[PDB]
């Protein structure tokens, strides 16, 4: 099973950076969702969980076919929520209907970073839409309520290492938790993109408490929370190394995100030799717009 990245026609990177704009224009707009925290944290989750599918033993899962547009997916309980971040985009993909599902699912992420001040996420063109019978069953996403050794051996899957996995679940400074869609509640409101995550992990004094759901999370005094599988990295000594690190070089921590990001968006794409190269996007701000 392979998956050979096809540009869509006559496209270019001018193209590209105008549904860019399009999406960082309506997030500067649309600024009101979750109590002012705006669209940026959703849309990161929607890209990664779109990713999140793939299965590197067989090729199945993963961005390219954009297959979060079928019911099957769209309506996995691990999504709920998504659909808020669907609806986002889903005028974008009316002005620019020439992309693929899969392109505009994973850009809207790579945009929400950037426009949220996080680093730049190179980013490549030409997933193409695949039919519903490649969708993925339910169940592949991760669960919450598990500890260290689960989170390692989840993402093998997904070919990622200790300092990838670390690197990843610092995206966990921005957004909260709901619990209508995960069971869980809280978190900080945050819509920049910084190291806060292995900060907070390091400095606050959390204490296991049983919520509203009747699931376990880690609280804060000062109002923050951790879920189990965000605790385990201060449990697990190699991936204390790793946090402490980040929460010490902001720079390093926004390199690794940045080629771990990228490699999530990309795992299971075959492209060939005479493809454009990765595209770095100018944010609203370096275009003065
Ligand atoms: C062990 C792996 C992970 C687990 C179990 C997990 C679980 C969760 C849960 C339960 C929520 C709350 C969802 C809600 O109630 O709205 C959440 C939120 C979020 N997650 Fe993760 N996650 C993981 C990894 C990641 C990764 C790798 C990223 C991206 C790089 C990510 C990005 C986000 C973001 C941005 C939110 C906030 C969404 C919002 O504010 O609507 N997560 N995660
Ligand atoms: C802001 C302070 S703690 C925190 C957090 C920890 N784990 C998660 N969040 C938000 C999404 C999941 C976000």
New binding site residues.
């Given amino acids: 099973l392979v998956h050979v990245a096809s540009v869509e026609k006559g496209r270019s990177y001018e193209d590209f950076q105008k549904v860019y704009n399009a999406i960082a224009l309506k997030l500067r707009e649309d600024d009101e969702y979750?109590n002012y925290?705006g669209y940026?944290?959703?849309l990161?989750?929607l890209?990664?969980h779109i990713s999140?599918t793939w299965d590197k033993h067989d090729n199945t899962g993963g961005s390219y076919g954009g297959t979060y547009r079928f019911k099957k997916e769209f309506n996995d309980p691990s999504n709920?929520?998504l659909q808020?971040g669907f609806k986002f985009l889903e005028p974008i993909h009316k002005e620019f209907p020439w992309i693929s599902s899969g392109d505009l699912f994973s850009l809207g992420?790579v945009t929400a970073v950037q426009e949220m001040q996080g680093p730049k996420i190179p980013w490549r063109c030409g997933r193409v839409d695949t039919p519903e019978d490649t969708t993925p069953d339910n169940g592949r996403?991760?669960?919450?309520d598990?500890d260290a050794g689960?989170?390692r051996t989840?993402?093998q899957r997904l070919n990622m290492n200790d300092r990838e996995?670390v690197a990843?679940?610092?995206?966990?400074a921005?957004?909260?938790?709901?619990?209508?869609?995960?069971?869980?509640?809280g978190?900080g409101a945050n819509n920049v993109f910084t190291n806060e995550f292995y900060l907070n992990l390091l400095n606050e004094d959390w204490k296991l408490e049983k919520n509203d759901a009747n699931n376990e999370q880690w609280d804060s005094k000062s109002g923050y929370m951790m879920?189990p599988?965000?605790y385990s990295l201060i449990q697990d000594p190699k991936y204390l190394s790793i946090v402490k690190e980040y929460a010490n070089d902001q720079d390093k921590f926004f390199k690794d995100?940045s080629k771990?990001?990228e490699k999530?968006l990309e795992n299971g794409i075959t492209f060939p030799k005479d493809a454009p190269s990765p595209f770095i996007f100018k944010t609203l701000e370096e275009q003065g717009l």
């Fill in positions: 979750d925290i940026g944290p959703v990161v989750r890209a990664w999140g709920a929520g808020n992420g996403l991760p669960d919450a598990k689960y989170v989840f993402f996995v990843l679940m610092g995206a966990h921005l957004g909260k938790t709901h619990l209508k869609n995960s069971g869980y509640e978190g879920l599988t965000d995100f771990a990001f999530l």
